[PDB]
Amino acid sequence: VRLDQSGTAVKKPGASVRVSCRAPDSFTVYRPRLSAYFIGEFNIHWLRQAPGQGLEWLGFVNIFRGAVKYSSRFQGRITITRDTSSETSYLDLGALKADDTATYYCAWDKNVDDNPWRLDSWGQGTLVIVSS
Amino acid sequence: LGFLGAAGSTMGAASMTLTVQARNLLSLKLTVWGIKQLQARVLAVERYLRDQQLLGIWGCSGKLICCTNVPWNSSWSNRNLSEIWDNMTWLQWDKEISNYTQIIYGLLEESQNQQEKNEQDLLAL
Amino acid sequence: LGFLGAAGSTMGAASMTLTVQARNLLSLKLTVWGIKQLQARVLAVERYLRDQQLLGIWGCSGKLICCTNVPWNSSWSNRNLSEIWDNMTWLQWDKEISNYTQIIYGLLEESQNQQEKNEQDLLAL
Amino acid sequence: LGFLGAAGSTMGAASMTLTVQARNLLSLKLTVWGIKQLQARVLAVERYLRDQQLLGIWGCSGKLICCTNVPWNSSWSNRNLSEIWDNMTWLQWDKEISNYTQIIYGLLEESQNQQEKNEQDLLAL
Amino acid sequence: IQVTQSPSSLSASIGDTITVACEVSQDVGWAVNWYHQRPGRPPYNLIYTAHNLAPGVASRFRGSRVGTYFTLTINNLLPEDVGTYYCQVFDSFAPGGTRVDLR
Amino acid sequence: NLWVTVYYGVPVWKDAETTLFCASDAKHNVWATHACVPTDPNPQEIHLENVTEEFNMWKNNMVEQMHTDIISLWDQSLKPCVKLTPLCVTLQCTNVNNITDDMRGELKNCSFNMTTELRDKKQKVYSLFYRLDVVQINKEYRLINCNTSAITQACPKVSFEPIPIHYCAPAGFAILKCKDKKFNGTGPCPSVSTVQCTHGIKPVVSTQLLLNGSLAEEEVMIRSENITNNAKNILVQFNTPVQINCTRPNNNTRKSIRIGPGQAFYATGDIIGDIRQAHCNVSKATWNETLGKVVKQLRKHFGNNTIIRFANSSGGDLEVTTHSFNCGGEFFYCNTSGLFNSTWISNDSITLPCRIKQIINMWQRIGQAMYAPPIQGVIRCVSNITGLILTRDGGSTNSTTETFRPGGGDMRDNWRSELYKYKVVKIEPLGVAPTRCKRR
């Protein structure tokens, strides 16, 4: 699936940043039994990578009902949501520090039982720079 | 061979491979495909049940080839046994005796009923 | 005669015309008529199969009338053979023994299983 | 006992009370419940009928226990008879034969057919 | 759930065979995924559940689990495979990763 | 010398999946119990012995099948009901009188110009709507679901109250029930008994607290698939029920509005008496004791010296953050922060605020949304509460304070608790065995 992502961003320390990841024509599945469209139970994961070191996991949003879950050491300053009408997912990171500057990826997870924590399609990556 | 393999063969050849083709007699929402499949399945089951009951009434249930006790009236076909068993195919033989088919079924049913009643009478003593 | 012809007749006639009234036990969109017809056909098939399985359990499959190995306890009925078979209709006998049917069915089932086991053990020689 | 009563028991106890579960193999608008129940009933009848097909092709129709005339090839299971019939329940036995069913099934039918043919050739004299 | 990866970096010439080791402090079963990131390029999955190939990846990568040890064999290396390999488990991710480059 | 023999009626089963039918014992209700075949008063449950069967609650097919079945029942039930397309019109909405501090702007007095009986003249008609059911553009408001999906109003006659349904496999199939009280989610169950129909299953609709569930026969039980996983929801099953009341103290009166030739739409008319917030009452002592039991049974999976902290929901849509459930015919979304606030370490009743929505789109379906009809009079619904849907938040390996929050959302996890001890088996009554016999 195509995962468009927002353009690069620059913010000041102590501000908030908003990153949007769009996955057109992928929020809905077919339930052939009822023969009706439903909202899929996919998980939109969010990953971050500082320049030089390996990736890190921020959170994920199950889009079926907007359920979320964040990493322990980011809790209290990151909010994750999705808009099913626009088929997009929004990451709102608040109170960025100097070390929070990095490239952020949105990842798509089919949430299949057989393969736990699998990301298939990745966004182009949005680089966010924080400084004064 | 397999299913219907020896259909055009002789009575002699075909009369020994009954099982290979008798075995294959039995092998969602309310959409068009679903209802068609369900109707087809129940129709196949009904046809097989009709045939099995027809076997059962003449006391041949569970027998591929059973012997009977009703004489073969030559009016149906006066051809020699060897001729019909060494040259024809089953389709031709069936076509020949198509119109003489209900009568033999009735004779078979009456003969089996009479034989069963006689057997019960004998088993009484 | 015909279907249910011997219904008013005594035992003697009815016990010889089983086949004539056993021959007719078995004889596309989602419209009300269509669904009613499909349910009716499935119901007929299910009833026939239930009866046939009950016959098969008692080891009498393929037979119109079969003899068994359990005796007739006088508790079920004390009426003698002669008037039973020359005096009353089948329906009257059924109404007379209807409330005793389950236990006798169980008796036949158990006896048939025991007889089959004994026959297998004897054949083991 | 009851349905599947001897499921965990050994071979001997199960082989004595087959009929308790043999007898329990068979027992409106177009809404969801209606179609679901209809499919369930048709599927149950079809499964029982396939079972009856396999039994009839082996010449054991109506018999809970029947014997055959083919050798038990040791390549399937070369284990002592007494330990098989006093140790392993039917489930474990199936789990140790499940790879080898189809072939033996075919053998059965073939033998049966051959036997029938031979029997017919004997009875023509 | 701690996850570590070895070696920190390695090098191999064209067409060789290499292995990368991932050690998980717990028995997480077969739920291991490996991800490859070319420099200046978002990473893409190549192996999931540690023994089943991802869509659209050449068959030269074959995974394997030996207890808590996880590794895959990379054969006949060609120079579009130079990059960074990370082994991810569950929520955790391997710090650093392994950098593979030609010599 | 040995010969094969077939054995009809052999007791051999295999794992299989097959459609099962409902059966309930006897007013129309949303579950078509009038179509279920009646169940026998005394099910012929049969105990077994010396038999061990592997159970996998998380790969069970029954749960998915029954979820699909419930979805179909819901869709077919609301299909032949009055449409509500004309309601998507401009609304003139004012703030509403005798209201406490918990209803500041919650209720909106909205008037529109719905057509009268004949489709030529407009009539000014007023009604009341809940603030979660309107969106601003006195001011102008529109129904919230007027730009994404159409609205259909459930017929007021049919009730949504759950009714127990028994699941019966078709002929030739059996349902294996595991009676092992200590049996966790996945594994062999030594004490397994066959049956023809499942026990009373109440298709309840809830997200955070498993209302009206089935209690475990021993100490509180925790179940999960790969409990190491964060994502996988952690099923809980209480031994002893935790009473809960969750009433609405208002006295709203229904009013009929003729929106077409015969199609009538029911609106919340005037409210007789004052207005008070809907609330849930839970006896604090019982909830505290239940939490103590659950943390005692939860320390086993992590260690005796670990720290367990109950935190409220992380966030998301209204149906997940708060405890959402049906009662009497009205949907409730109740703030659950009052419960999951404890920080367990090695008379009075708590009250949970609630809010009421009238557009319901559970099992999100792009194109349809139910308008819950108003219910006249006060509503009270005692509920037993049997299980929770907790999810372990992630944790850095340095610290050892696991935090549990009441997640959920998916109804499959909700329903896996009621079918946790059931499996479907296909009987294979054919078998072959060696024997000394040799058929003549």
Ligand SMILES: *[C@@H]1O[C@H](CO)[C@@H](O[C@@H]2O[C@H](CO)[C@@H](O[C@@H]3O[C@H](CO[C@H]4O[C@H](CO)[C@@H](O)[C@H](O)[C@@H]4O)[C@@H](O)[C@H](O[C@H]4O[C@H](CO)[C@@H](O)[C@H](O)[C@@H]4O)[C@@H]3O)[C@H](O)[C@H]2NC(C)=O)[C@H](O)[C@H]1NC(C)=O
């Ligand atoms: C978990 O399980 C519990 C079981 O205890 C459920 O509690 C039931 O909830 C329903 C839903 O409200 C209750 O049903 C209502 O009962 C009211 C009381 O009825 C009694 O009293 C009147 C006299 O006042 C008698 O006439 C009557 O026979 C009863 O003895 C009724 O007044 C309500 O009537 C409304 O609905 C009916 C149709 O059912 C309409 O005809 C009326 O006009 C009116 O609109 C209603 O019937 C029920 O009483 C509760 N208890 C029991 C034992 O069932 C929980 O709801 C359930 N929770 C979940 C989430 O599933």
Ligand SMILES: *[C@@H]1O[C@H](CO)[C@@H](O[C@@H]2O[C@H](CO)[C@@H](O[C@@H]3O[C@H](CO)[C@@H](O)[C@H](O)[C@@H]3O)[C@H](O)[C@H]2NC(C)=O)[C@H](O)[C@H]1NC(C)=O
């Ligand atoms: C929601 O708003 C509507 C519209 O205002 C309210 O209905 C209106 O209520 C008033 C109450 O004063 C009615 O006024 C009438 O006044 C005459 C005398 O002038 C009196 O005799 C009547 O008994 C009545 O009080 C008015 O007719 C009525 N309808 C309209 C169209 O205005 C409604 O009460 C409001 N509901 C809530 C909960 O606030």
Ligand SMILES: *[C@@H]1O[C@H](CO)[C@@H](O[C@@H]2O[C@H](CO)[C@@H](O)[C@H](O)[C@H]2NC(C)=O)[C@H](O)[C@H]1NC(C)=O
């Ligand atoms: C389950 O296993 C036990 C033991 O393996 C069985 O107990 C046997 O019962 C019969 C019936 O009286 C005795 O003759 C045997 O001696 C018992 N076994 C032993 C080892 O003494 C039991 O029958 C099996 N089945 C059930 C349903 O419990």
Ligand SMILES: *[C@@H]1O[C@H](CO)[C@@H](O[C@@H]2O[C@H](CO)[C@@H](O)[C@H](O)[C@H]2NC(C)=O)[C@H](O)[C@H]1NC(C)=O
């Ligand atoms: C966690 O999940 C993994 C896989 O999702 C389980 O590993 C087993 O993997 C094999 C692969 O062939 C499957 O056949 C088994 O069915 C899996 N086991 C189970 C119980 O499903 C692993 O067992 C799970 N549990 C733990 C504690 O790791």
Ligand SMILES: *[C@@H]1O[C@H](CO)[C@@H](O[C@@H]2O[C@H](CO)[C@@H](O)[C@H](O)[C@H]2NC(C)=O)[C@H](O)[C@H]1NC(C)=O
């Ligand atoms: C349908 O209408 C709703 C209500 O206005 C829209 O949701 C709002 O969208 C704006 C767009 O910037 C947001 O700022 C608001 O926060 C949204 N409101 C809520 C309650 O989330 C929705 O986008 C509309 N959908 C379409 C397809 O037009």
Ligand SMILES: *[C@@H]1O[C@H](CO)[C@@H](O[C@@H]2O[C@H](CO)[C@@H](O)[C@H](O)[C@H]2NC(C)=O)[C@H](O)[C@H]1NC(C)=O
């Ligand atoms: C549920 O109980 C079963 C019982 O067999 C557990 O399965 C094994 O249990 C033993 C000891 O209890 C462990 O050493 C194994 O690692 C378990 N195997 C697997 C595949 O889990 C099972 O772990 C229990 N599950 C839960 C969630 O408690």
Ligand SMILES: *[C@@H]1O[C@H](CO)[C@@H](O[C@@H]2O[C@H](CO)[C@@H](O)[C@H](O)[C@H]2NC(C)=O)[C@H](O)[C@H]1NC(C)=O
């Ligand atoms: C809730 O409102 C209803 C509807 O009015 C009340 O039921 C009747 O109310 C009228 C006046 O509105 C009284 O004259 C009747 O006597 C009431 N019927 C009774 C009491 O059976 C109902 O009383 C109101 N609820 C409360 C708690 O006051």
Ligand SMILES: *[C@@H]1O[C@H](CO)[C@@H](O[C@@H]2O[C@H](CO)[C@@H](O)[C@H](O)[C@H]2NC(C)=O)[C@H](O)[C@H]1NC(C)=O
């Ligand atoms: C839920 O508990 C609250 C606790 O305050 C109850 O509210 C009180 O109810 C009594 C009942 O007579 C009133 O006298 C009080 O004025 C109410 N408020 C306070 C602050 O005490 C409420 O009634 C309970 N509801 C249910 C359904 O149990």
Ligand SMILES: *[C@@H]1O[C@H](CO)[C@@H](O[C@@H]2O[C@H](CO)[C@@H](O)[C@H](O)[C@H]2NC(C)=O)[C@H](O)[C@H]1NC(C)=O
């Ligand atoms: C929930 O409501 C029920 C019914 O109103 C309460 O149970 C009754 O409470 C009263 C008041 O103490 C007792 O006199 C009764 O004996 C209780 N039982 C019954 C059947 O009426 C229950 O206490 C409430 N739950 C709370 C407040 O947490």
Ligand SMILES: *[C@@H]1O[C@H](CO)[C@@H](O[C@@H]2O[C@H](CO)[C@@H](O)[C@H](O)[C@H]2NC(C)=O)[C@H](O)[C@H]1NC(C)=O
């Ligand atoms: C969970 O609890 C937190 C605090 O314990 C709640 O956070 C408050 O949220 C409200 C509005 O949602 C804000 O006005 C407060 O400023 C927040 N306070 C803090 C300390 O965060 C949160 O709302 C609760 N969530 C739920 C679903 O109950």
Ligand SMILES: *[C@@H]1O[C@H](CO)[C@@H](O[C@@H]2O[C@H](CO)[C@@H](O)[C@H](O)[C@H]2NC(C)=O)[C@H](O)[C@H]1NC(C)=O
């Ligand atoms: C749910 O209940 C919590 C209980 O704390 C509410 O949180 C408080 O909300 C009030 C607003 O009435 C604020 O003044 C407090 O600062 C909040 N405290 C905390 C610790 O968050 C919360 O607002 C309620 N509603 C939701 C949606 O969470």
Ligand SMILES: *[C@@H]1O[C@H](CO)[C@@H](O)[C@H](O)[C@H]1NC(C)=O
């Ligand atoms: C077809 O005819 C040939 C001609 O002799 C014969 O040998 C053969 O058995 C017949 N049947 C088949 C199936 O070939």
Ligand SMILES: *[C@@H]1O[C@H](CO)[C@@H](O)[C@H](O)[C@H]1NC(C)=O
């Ligand atoms: C009706 O009863 C009379 C009694 O005399 C009997 O002769 C006659 O055969 C009966 N009818 C039939 C059709 O058997």
Ligand SMILES: *[C@@H]1O[C@H](CO)[C@@H](O)[C@H](O)[C@H]1NC(C)=O
């Ligand atoms: C609950 O019980 C524990 C001990 O069982 C006690 O320490 C605590 O004060 C009680 N109340 C709450 C709200 O935790």
Ligand SMILES: *[C@@H]1O[C@H](CO)[C@@H](O)[C@H](O)[C@H]1NC(C)=O
């Ligand atoms: C709640 O649990 C108790 C426990 O005995 C039980 O008696 C009762 O029927 C259950 N349901 C209700 C509504 O109380």
